[PDB]
Structure formats: C-alpha cells, structure tokens
C-alpha cells in the first residue's frame with residue numbers, strides 16, 4: 001500500500017553522470033550550458049538493464065553504492081530505479097532498439113536466466129529499496145501491433161516471460177511498474193479498453209503479486225502530464241495528455257481487478273507542444289525539453305511519482321539509412337540528425353533538451 005517513492009531520496013546513477021561529464025561537457029564550451037549540463041547530471045533517472053552483461057556489473061555496482069550511502073546515514077535513505085529491458089525479439093514494431101537475443105536462438109531460456117539472476121542480486125540487496133519498470137513497449141505492442149509479424153510471432157513469448165518476471169521479481173523490497181505505453185498510444189479511445197483487458201489479465205494470471213504497484217506511462221516519449229489545451233498533433237484523442245489517459249485508464253483497470261498506481265516519465269516533456277509533426281513520431285523528436293524533476297509530490301491520487309525513465313541525451317535510434325537498426329521514424333523531418341545508435345550519446349539532442357528545459361537549469 002505504500003508509495004515506494006515516499007520516504008526515500010532517489011539515487012542518481014553514475015552512468016548517466018559519466019556520459020554527461022566525459023562526453024557532453026568537454027564538447028560544450030558555453031558557460032551556461034556547461035553549468036546546466038552539470039546540474040542535469042544529478043537528476044535521478046532510471047538505470048537500464050538493456051543488455052545481459054549489465055546485471056552482474058552495473059546493477060551490482062549501483063546497489064553497492066546505495067547500500068554504502070545508506071549505511072553511512074543517508075536520510076532519507078536512497079532507493080534505486082531500474083528498467084528491465086532485454087526481452088528476446090525486443091522492440092518488435094520497430095528497428096531502432098532491436099536487442100541482443102532472439103526467440104529463434106534460445107532467447108526464452110536466456111531471458112529466464114537473466115530474470116533469475118536479477119532476482120538473486122535483488123535478494124542479496126534486500127536492504128535497498130528498489131523500484132522497477134518492466135519492459136518498455138512490450139505489452140503496448142501486444143495491444144496494437146499484432147498485425148506486425150515480429151510482434152505476433154513474439155506475443156505468446158512476451159506473455160509467458162512477463163508473467164515469469166512479475167512472479168520472480170515479487171520481492172518484499174521491490175515495487176514493479178509494468179510499462180503501459182502513453183496517451184497517444186494506448187489512450188486512444190479505440191485502444192484503451194483492450195489495453196485494460198490485457199494488463200488486468202496479465203496481472204491476474206501472475207497471481208496478483210504484491211510487489212506489482214501499477215504501470216508506468218510516457219516512457220521514452222514526450223507527452224505532457226497536464227496542459228490546458230490539446231496539442232494539434234493529438235486531435236481527435238480526448239486523452240491528449242497523461243493525466244487524461246490515467247484518469248480514463250485507471251477505472252477500466254480497477255473494474256477488471258487491477259487497481260494500478262502510476263508513474264509518469266517527464267524527462268523529455270518540458271516543452272509543449274513539442275515539434276512532433278505527428279503524434280506517432282517517437283524518434284529523437286525536435287522541439288523537446290527536459291521536464292518536471294522526479295518527485296512523489298504529484299498532487300494526484302493515482303500517480304505515485306513523476307519520474308525520468310528515458311535518460312535525455314541517450315539516442316532513440318540511428319538516422320544512418322545504411323545501418324542494420326535504421327528505422328524510418330528516425331529519418332523523418334522532425335527527428336534530429338545525424339543521430340547515433342539507440343542508447344548512444346547524442347550530444348546535439350542533449351543540448352536541445354537543456355535549451356528547452358522547463359523548469360530551466
């Protein structure tokens with residue numbers, strides 16, 4: 001029943017800090033941008049377990065640092081924020097963030113082992129409050145993208161592995177939030193009921209694990225929490241921001257046995273409207289800014305926290321048309337270019353986010 005974001009400070013991980021200080025700052029001479037970059041490096045965004053190698057290295061290192069700070073007397077205690085993101089046939093409706101594992105090459109077994117190892121590590125660090133986002137985009141793709149061969153082919157696997165993860169990571173010091181797309185994906189009137197059906201059924205089939213707190217929205221996207229008028233690209237969706245989406249979604253979930261609490265990514269939501277020409281333009285969108293800083297003080301009963309899940313500056317996908325992971329969304333007129341591989345540092349993007357930051361740095 002506890003909000004896992006209440007009574008703790010959020011740990012800012014050293015990986016994002018290191019990117020900003022070793023890659024970004026040496027390329028930013030401008031005094032104000034340099035000072036702003038140093039400040040954003042300290043905003044506590046989620047750390048992503050995007051490859052298996054990170055489990056026994058980066059995850060352990062962060063948890064070990066938090067343990068040490070808390071043992072020294074940190075008040076409030078620090079909590080960790082981790083994304084689980086390595087399903088086989090990952091990112092099934094796009095090319096940009098295809099992952100290391102494939103269902104056709106022992107991916108299911110590889111993933112179960114990854115989840116088992118994460119469980120063992122979280123058990124060993126049961127003294128550290130841990131908040132998890134489970135597999136961005138996965139279930140949202142199962143709602144709207146069964147017409148995509150990679151997604152339809154992965155659906156049964158996604159379902160089995162999601163339930164596996166929810167049960168295995170159901171630990172006394174863990175809070176989990178399943179990814180649930182965003183207002184412009186699942187919040188469309190035609191998608192929102194089948195979305196609620198799917199998430200509630202997964203929840204029931206997982207045995208309603210205690211550690212499942214709810215859902216995460218807007219991960220790696222740009223939507224407003226709350227604006228007074230719909231951005232043009234949102235019409236005619238009545239759920240044109242995350243507040244509308246959540247207020248519509250929660251009753252439908254609760255009626256199906258899943259009284260989900262929410263966290264909302266605001267890391268790239270500071271400038272509204274954005275420069276997106278169409279709402280479905282997700283890749284390195286121009287006209288965006290760093291948004292509201294992580295906090296549990298949301299003013300909304302259904303929202304545990306505003307968070308930064310996607311770390312701004314880390315690319316959404318390459319704009320190189322010859323690359324294996326080239327996705328046409330990343331070559332569009334409203335995608336910033338040239339852009340490196342997904343997850344790699346995109347310094348010009350980082351600068352855009354600093355310039356447009358609201359609140360400013």
Ligand SMILES: CO[C@@H]1O[C@H](CO)[C@@H](S[C@@H]2O[C@H](CO)[C@@H](O[C@@H]3O[C@H](CO)[C@@H](O[C@@H]4O[C@H](CO)[C@@H](N)[C@H](O)[C@H]4O)[C@H](O)[C@H]3O)[C@H](O)[C@H]2O)[C@H](O)[C@H]1O
Nearest residue numbers: 091093094137144184185188190219220221236279280282
């Ligand atoms: C009445 O107007 C029309 O209505 C229909 C609905 O009745 C929509 S169709 C609706 O369009 C949305 C675009 O506004 C689609 O949402 C997009 O889906 C894609 C997946 O196919 C999402 O892409 C994913 O984005 C992630 C970041 O958020 C990223 N990590 C992933 O790699 C990427 O695949 C995208 O965010 C989302 O906005 C929706 O599926 C579709 O049902 C019509 O657009 C209106 O004109």
Ligand SMILES: CO[C@@H]1O[C@H](CO)[C@@H](S[C@@H]2O[C@H](CO)[C@@H](O[C@@H]3O[C@H](CO)[C@@H](O)[C@H](O)[C@H]3O)[C@H](O)[C@H]2O)[C@H](O)[C@H]1O
Nearest residue numbers: 015048050054097220310311314315316342343344345
């Ligand atoms: C939805 O798209 C995904 O977005 C997430 C969040 O941006 C990233 S996770 C991101 O991934 C990169 C690349 O693996 C990591 O950067 C790398 O860190 C390793 C050490 O682990 C270094 O050796 C390397 O030089 C560095 O580039 C980030 O630390 C992660 O946060 C994901 O890749 C996207 O697909």
Ligand SMILES: *[C@@H]1O[C@H](CO)[C@@H](O)[C@H](O)[C@H]1NC(C)=O
Nearest residue numbers: 052053055056110113114117
């Ligand atoms: C994943 O990493 C673990 C160590 O955490 C390792 O033992 C295992 O072999 C790796 N999985 C694959 C499929 O290589």
